[PDB]
Design an enzyme around this catalytic site. Structure first.
Site, PDB file in Angstrom:
ATOM      1  N   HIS A  12       0.853  -1.113   0.033  1.00 56.38           N
ATOM      2  CA  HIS A  12       0.024  -0.037  -0.122  1.00 56.38           C
ATOM      3  C   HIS A  12       0.913   1.287  -0.058  1.00 56.38           C
ATOM      4  CE1 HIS A  12      -3.480  -2.319   0.545  1.00 56.38           C
ATOM      5  NE2 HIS A  12      -3.119  -2.855   1.815  1.00 56.38           N
ATOM      6  N   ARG A  20      -0.001   6.884 -13.339  1.00 59.67           N
ATOM      7  CA  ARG A  20      -0.641   6.281 -12.503  1.00 59.67           C
ATOM      8  C   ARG A  20      -1.879   5.406 -13.447  1.00 59.67           C
ATOM      9  NH1 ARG A  20      -1.022  10.798  -8.340  1.00 59.67           N
ATOM     10  NH2 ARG A  20      -2.698   9.645  -7.639  1.00 59.67           N
ATOM     11  N   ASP A  21      -1.282   4.833 -14.498  1.00 58.24           N
ATOM     12  CA  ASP A  21      -2.190   4.299 -15.522  1.00 58.24           C
ATOM     13  C   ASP A  21      -2.343   3.031 -15.313  1.00 58.24           C
ATOM     14  OD1 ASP A  21       0.305   3.621 -16.328  1.00 58.24           O
ATOM     15  OD2 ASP A  21      -0.110   4.127 -18.586  1.00 58.24           O
ATOM     16  N   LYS A  39      -4.716 -10.206  -6.682  1.00 55.45           N
ATOM     17  CA  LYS A  39      -5.518  -9.388  -5.931  1.00 55.45           C
ATOM     18  C   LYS A  39      -6.663  -8.718  -6.457  1.00 55.45           C
ATOM     19  CE  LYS A  39      -4.564  -6.550  -1.802  1.00 55.45           C
ATOM     20  NZ  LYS A  39      -5.779  -6.319  -1.302  1.00 55.45           N
ATOM     21  N   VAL A 102      -7.394   8.882   4.104  1.00 54.59           N
ATOM     22  CA  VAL A 102      -7.512   6.998   3.937  1.00 54.59           C
ATOM     23  C   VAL A 102      -7.841   6.706   5.230  1.00 54.59           C
ATOM     24  CG1 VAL A 102      -5.963   7.208   2.065  1.00 54.59           C
ATOM     25  CG2 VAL A 102      -5.227   6.684   4.337  1.00 54.59           C
ATOM     26  N   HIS A 113      -2.761  -2.082   8.097  1.00 55.64           N
ATOM     27  CA  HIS A 113      -3.732  -2.358   7.513  1.00 55.64           C
ATOM     28  C   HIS A 113      -4.431  -1.375   6.697  1.00 55.64           C
ATOM     29  CE1 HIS A 113      -7.740  -4.412   6.585  1.00 55.64           C
ATOM     30  NE2 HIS A 113      -8.360  -3.165   7.006  1.00 55.64           N
TER      31      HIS A 113
END
Length: 120
Positions: A12, A20-21, A39, A102, A113
């Site tokens: 993460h 960021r494609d 995932k 976030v 997490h």
């Protein structure tokens, strides 16, 4: 000291992505070892780590729901979402860049997490 935290950075965190494609996502999901099996959804947070850890305390977070924390600041983020039907590689991803706060869970001051529900 915390393997769940080092593991959090792996799944993460990506400091400087640039583009960021879709191909960004397909590459990093592979590089980060998230493609056996694929995932189905995974989100990366960009920028520095100080801001992210800080979500674990007053400085940049508040308690959230049943044992989660929600950041005060907004982060640059990229959510990679699997498509194509199959659970197994090659894993095709669609990229969605975003900018918002976030949610995470912390242990001993470290995020261990990322709550993916908000990026669905």
């Amino acid at each position: 000291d915390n393997s769940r935290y080092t593991h959090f950075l792996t799944q993460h965190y990506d400091a400087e992505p640039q583009g960021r494609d879709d191909r960004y996502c397909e590459s990093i999901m592979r590089r980060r070892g998230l493609t056996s099996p694929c995932k189905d959804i995974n989100t990366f947070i960009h920028g520095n780590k100080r801001s992210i850890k800080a979500i674990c305390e007053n400085k940049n977070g508040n308690p959230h729901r049943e044992n989660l924390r929600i950041s005060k600041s907004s982060f640059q983020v990229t959510t990679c979402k699997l498509h194509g039907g199959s659970p197994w590689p090659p894993c095709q991803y669609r990229a969605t860049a975003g900018f918002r706060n976030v949610v995470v869970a912390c242990e001993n001051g470290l995020p261990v997490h990322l709550d993916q529900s908000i990026f669905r």
